[PDB]
C-alpha cells in the first residue's frame, strides 16, 4: 500500500517534470489595469490589488522598481522568479498570469488570494493547535517535494509568504529567491530567522535548507514565535549556529522529535536530506493522521476559512502607505533586464 503510493508519486513527478520542462524552454501592459490598493511592501517595491479593466477580474500585481533592483544578486533573482513562476503548476503555488515591463518597473501579475497572509492570522490568534499547524505543514511538504523534484530550491519560507485561499488552503507566493540548483549554490540570501546554519556560515548549500526552514515554520506555527528569536540578525545567527533548540511545554513529544530531525545542523542527519528523502518526513509519527493524497486533492476540510465580502475584498490584509506609480520617459536598465 505505502509502496503502491510511492510508485504513484514517482509516476506523478515524472509527468510533472515533463510538463515543467516544456514550459521552461518557452503579455500585458500597465494601463490594462486599475490599481486599487497596496497589499504588501518590500525593499524593491510593492504588491497591489489591481482590476483588469476589460474582464473585471482581480489580480495581485508585484511591481519592482528596476532602479531599486540594483545589486547583482538582486537582478538575477528577479529573472529566476519570473521564469520559475511561469513554468510551475501545483495546487499550493500561486499562479502567474501576466508579466511585462516598462521604462521604470517590472511587473508580475498573479491570481489574487483574498484570505490574507498566514502571518497576520497567526499573530492575531497567537499560535495554531498542532492539527491546524499540521494541515498547513503537509501542504508545504508536498510543495517542496514538487519543487525539489524539479531541482528548484525555494529559499524564503515564512508565514509572510503563505497566503490563505477561499478554501482555507495555502498558496506559496514570492519566488524572489527561488532557483534551479542541481547540486549546491552559494548566495547568502533569505530571512534571518529561517536561515539554515550552512547559509549563515558561507558554506555551499543545497535543497536541505528548505527542510530546515520547514522546521522553523512548524515551530513558529505551533508556538507563536520561531525557535531562534532575537532583536537583531547577528543575535539570531548566533542562536541558529549554536543550534540549541528549546520547546514550549505544550509541544507534543512527536512534534519535538520531528523538529529535532529538521532543525538538524548535521546534513548527514537532517530529515529531507537522507536516503529516504521526503519520506522520512511524510512517514513521521507527527504526520500519522495525514492523508497525503487527500491533502493534494484538497479533500480535507480546512481548520480556518477566511470570510470574504465579495471580489476585490481586502479586509484580510493590513493597510500600507500608498505611493503613486511613476513611469519615466527614459528607459532605465534596459540591457540588464532584456531577458525579462
Amino acid at each position: 500500500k505505502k509502496g503502491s503510493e510511492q510508485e504513484s508519486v514517482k509516476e506523478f513527478l515524472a509527468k510533472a517534470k515533463e510538463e515543467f520542462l516544456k514550459k521552461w524552454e518557452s503579455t500585458a501592459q500597465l494601463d490594462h489595469f486599475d490599481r486599487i490598493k497596496t497589499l504588501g511592501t518590500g525593499s524593491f517595491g510593492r504588491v497591489m490589488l489591481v482590476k483588469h479593466k476589460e474582464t473585471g477580474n482581480h489580480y495581485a500585481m508585484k511591481i519592482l522598481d528596476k532602479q531599486k533592483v540594483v545589486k547583482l544578486k538582486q537582478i538575477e533573482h528577479t529573472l529566476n522568479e519570473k521564469r520559475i513562476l511561469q513554468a510551475v503548476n501545483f495546487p499550493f503555488l500561486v499562479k502567474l498570469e501576466f508579466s511585462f515591463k516598462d521604462n521604470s518597473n517590472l511587473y508580475m501579475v498573479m491570481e489574487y488570494v483574498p484570505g490574507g497572509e498566514m502571518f497576520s492570522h497567526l499573530r492575531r490568534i497567537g499560535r495554531f493547535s498542532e492539527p491546524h499547524a499540521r494541515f498547513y505543514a503537509a501542504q508545504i511538504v508536498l510543495t517542496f517535494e514538487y519543487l525539489h523534484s524539479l531541482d528548484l530550491i525555494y529559499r524564503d519560507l515564512k508565514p509572510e509568504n503563505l497566503l490563505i485561499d477561499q478554501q482555507g488552503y495555502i498558496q506559496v507566493t514570492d519566488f524572489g529567491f527561488a532557483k534551479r540548483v542541481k547540486g549546491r549554490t552559494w548566495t547568502l540570501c533569505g530571512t534571518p530567522e529561517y536561515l539554515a546554519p550552512e547559509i549563515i556560515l558561507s558554506k555551499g548549500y543545497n535543497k536541505a535548507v528548505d527542510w530546515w526552514a520547514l522546521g522553523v515554520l512548524i515551530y513558529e506555527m505551533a508556538a507563536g514565535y520561531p525557535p531562534f528569536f532575537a532583536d537583531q540578525p547577528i543575535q539570531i545567527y548566533e542562536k541558529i549556529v549554536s543550534g540549541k533548540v528549546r520547546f514550549p511545554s505544550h509541544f507534543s513529544s512527536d512534534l519535538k522529535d520531528l523538529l529535532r530531525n529538521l532543525l538538524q545542523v548535521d546534513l548527514t542527519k537532517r530529515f529531507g536530506n537522507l536516503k529516504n528523502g521526503v519520506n522520512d518526513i511524510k512517514n513521521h509519527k507527527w504526520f500519522a493522521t495525514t492523508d497525503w493524497i487527500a491533502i493534494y486533492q484538497r479533500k480535507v476540510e480546512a481548520p480556518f476559512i477566511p470570510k470574504f465580502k465579495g471580489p476585490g475584498d481586502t479586509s484580510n490584509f493590513d493597510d500600507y502607505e500608498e505611493e503613486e506609480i511613476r513611469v519615466s520617459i527614459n528607459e532605465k536598465c534596459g540591457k540588464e533586464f532584456t531577458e525579462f
Partner: peptide
C-alpha cells in the same frame, strides 16, 4: 524572550 514580532524582510547579500 525579546525578538522580532513584525514582518521580516529578506536579505539579499549579507
Amino acid at each position: 524572550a525579546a525578538g522580532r514580532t513584525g514582518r521580516r524582510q529578506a536579505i539579499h547579500d549579507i
